[PDB]
Design a protein around this ligand. Structure first.
Ligand SMILES: [K+]
Ligand SMILES: [Mg+2]
Ligand SMILES: [Zn+2]
Lengths: 128, 125, 37, 136, 176
RNA sequence: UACUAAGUGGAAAAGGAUGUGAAAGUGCUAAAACAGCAAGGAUGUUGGCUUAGAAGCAGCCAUCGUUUAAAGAGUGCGUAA
RNA sequence: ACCUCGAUGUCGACUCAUCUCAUCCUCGAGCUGAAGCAGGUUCGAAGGGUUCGGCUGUUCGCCGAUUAAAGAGAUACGUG
């Protein structure tokens, strides 16, 4: 099993999965298929390795906390947590948590909120 | 404390007194994702899957007035699945969960006040 | 081998034994052997 | 280097430390203190080494109080000279430390860290040290 | 503790007879003799398909013996019923091993010829030219001969070459 | 009547140490203790500074929530990532 | 400033060596920022060996060419 952050719009120049016995030419078309709904983003993909050289892949969301910068309206958070540079409404956090649901292993939407609350505090952002 | 242990036994004993299924499973070869995946498949909030130490299980079953159920929890790692109402689906869920995974044991248990064996799990599933 | 007046463990697994009335230390990393007290 | 700015009489009598610690018997400012179990003379240089050890290992959070001070001077005759014909010049200052004087003491930093700081300190001093804690 | 451990002497072919200063343990593979020293403070009593032994007192050396003879009895029993073996991977370039009569001979980087006499009760086998399998009845002799083979060319970290014991992860030092 | 295993006794320190004895309390203990043995030891995360290459591990800035019996922006090892 | 002044001859060399180990070589072993060669350091070891020359009253030394190496010390700074 080797995870990699293959870009969603491009898949063709490369060899570190070739030592796994992966047939690169047959899977490059598949990477550009389902990912075409979210072009221009770097999508992480899990790669299981079956003995028979069969393979099944699982795409994931764009990395957490990147979205928090957008909701805050500020390009970068504080280097010091005590310095409350930004503030975000709890309703806006609901919009963010829903996007991450496929990646998040959180049991409930209410718990999914709590998981994002520990990420908002890393940026020093107030939860209002 | 003695009081804390008694409360845990009493709570478990009371739960086993209203259950429609108690099924004993070895917790061997169960990953953290598998622990969350099996619980998630058990979807409907009427069932629980928990790794429980044998000494608690034994006292709880003993005070719930169960018998011959000692063999399921005798000398083995013992997670428990206990569901409510339509209990048959829970057994099929755990039976297809092992089969999907590398392995897992399915020792047996009690279905609607009736003892079943390991071999009878497939029949129910 | 390190010969020192005071021998104390340097790693997590550097155990201390007493062999032939002499206190010594053993680690899986052979740089940590000590002797003579 | 700790040193009295100026003293009255430059060449005084040596003070024997064979006692049981007139004054400074107990820790008085911090939670832990370093006690001696054999009286001695520790000069300004040794106080400096101990102070810098405690400061280096203390981090930028806590505080260290030095209780003793090299009040007394001390002389040393120049080398390859016959005896008599005067008293030699003063060379180095020294703090008399009787048995059982809480000389160093620390504050406002975790327990184990303070114990380690004190152990790192007492290895510079000649006196066989010991660890004491504030009463209550 | 190992002093208070219940030995299960299976009554298949293993019989145990205690003399004053010797223990004789016999089984399917080969009789074994244990030479106990006098003033032994342990009381060895055996049952049918079970064995329990106790010390008279709480003296330190007695507490040591209480465990160590239990261990030796268990190892002698398991050896005389199943037998021990050690397994040596002779790894290298021009290295090889083989047997000739009673003498195991070896070729290593040595310009000197290497031969070695096997003691009684130990049988080596060279199933592949880079493998040695030493089979014995008591752990002590098989281990002794394993190390007598190993002393000739110990492993190195720069390259793994050596008389490596099977499944031992020698550390790696990379030189350039 | 106990203590000593060192020929201490029959030279000596700062300092180091599962040597052994005595006493004092404190904590778990047959609703199973300690060690060992059989399982698992996760997601956010590839947070970001940035290094052709540092994404749990060259170092550096906050250094926490979430799935559960359990989980360290990871105990340390070991990767040009 | 304790024996020695009604005398205990003092530097260096020569001859003869003797002893200690805190070892220069020879010997055995560990760790390595030890690939090999050659090393750096530590442990044990005192059986044996441990140069010739220029200058200098020389010890000491600087220098040349060797050697496996050209030890540190003690013995009234050994030895009239
Ligand atoms: K004279
Ligand atoms: Mg004459
Ligand atoms: Zn270590």
């Amino acid at each position: 099993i080797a995870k990699i952050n293959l870009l969603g719009g491009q898949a063709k120049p490369g060899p570190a999965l070739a030592s796994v016995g992966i047939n690169m030419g047959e899977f490059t078309k598949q990477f550009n298929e389902k990912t075409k709904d979210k072009q221009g983003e770097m999508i992480p993909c899990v790669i299981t390795a079956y003995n028979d050289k069969s393979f099944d892949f699982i795409l994931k969301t764009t990395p957490v906390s990147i979205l928090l910068k957008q909701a805050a309206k500020l390009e970068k958070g504080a280097k010091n947590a005590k310095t409350i540079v930004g503030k975000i409404t709890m309703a806006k956090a609901k919009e963010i948590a829903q996007y991450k649901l496929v990646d998040l292993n959180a049991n409930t939407v209410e718990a999914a909120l709590k998981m994002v609350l520990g990420t908002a505090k890393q940026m020093g952002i107030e939860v209002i | 404390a003695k009081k804390d242990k008694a409360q845990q036994v009493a709570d478990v004993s009371h739960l086993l007194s209203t259950s429609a299924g108690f099924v004993i499973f070895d917790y061997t070869s169960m990953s953290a994702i598998e622990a969350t995946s099996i619980r998630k498949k058990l979807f409907k909030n009427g069932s629980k899957i928990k790794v429980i130490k044998n000494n608690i299980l034994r006292r709880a079953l003993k005070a719930g007035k169960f018998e011959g159920i000692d063999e399921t929890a005798i000398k083995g790692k013992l997670a428990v699945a206990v569901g409510v109402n339509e209990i048959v689906e829970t057994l099929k869920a755990v039976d297809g969960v092992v089969k999907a995974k590398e392995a897992m044991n399915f020792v047996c248990g009690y279905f609607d006040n009736r003892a079943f064996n390991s071999a009878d799990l497939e029949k129910i599933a | 081998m390190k010969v020192r007046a005071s021998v104390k463990p340097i790693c997590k697994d550097c155990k201390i034994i007493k062999r032939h009335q002499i206190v010594r230390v053993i680690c899986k990393t052979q740089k940590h052997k000590q002797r003579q007290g | 280097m700790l040193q009295p700015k100026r003293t009255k009489y430059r060449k005084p009598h040596n003070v024997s430390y064979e006692g049981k610690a007139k004054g400074n018997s107990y820790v008085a400012f911090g939670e832990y203190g370093l006690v001696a179990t054999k009286g001695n003379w520790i000069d300004a240089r040794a106080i400096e080494s101990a102070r810098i050890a405690i400061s280096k290992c203390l981090g930028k959070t806590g505080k260290m109080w030095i209780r003793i001070f090299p009040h007394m001077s001390k002389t040393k005759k120049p080398l390859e000279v016959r005896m008599g014909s005067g008293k030699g010049n003063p060379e180095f200052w020294v703090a008399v430390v009787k048995q059982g004087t809480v000389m160093f003491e620390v504050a406002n930093i975790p327990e184990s860290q303070m114990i380690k700081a004190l152990t790192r300190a007492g290895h510079k001093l000649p006196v066989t040290w010991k660890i004491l804690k504030r009463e209550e | 503790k190992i002093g208070n451990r219940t030995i299960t002497l299976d009554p298949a072919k293993v019989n145990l007879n205690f003399q004053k200063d010797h223990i004789a343990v016999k089984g399917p593979l080969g009789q074994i003799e244990l030479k106990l020293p006098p003033n032994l403070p342990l009381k060895f009593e055996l049952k049918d398909n079970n064995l329990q032994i106790t010390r008279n007192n709480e003296l330190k050396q007695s507490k040591i013996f209480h465990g160590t003879y239990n261990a030796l009895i268990t190892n002698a029993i398991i050896g005389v019923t199943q037998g021990f073996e050690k397994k040596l991977r002779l790894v290298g370039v021009g290295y090889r091993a083989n047997v000739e009569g009673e003498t195991l001979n070896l070729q290593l980087g040595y310009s000197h010829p290497i031969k070695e006499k096997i003691p009684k009760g130990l049988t080596v086998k060279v199933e592949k030219n880079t493998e040695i399998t030493i089979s014995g009845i008591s752990k002590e002799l098989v281990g002794q001969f394993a190390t007598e083979v190993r002393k000739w060319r110990k492993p190195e970290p720069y390259k793994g070459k050596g008389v490596l014991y099977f499944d031992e992860v020698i550390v790696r030092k990379a030189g350039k």
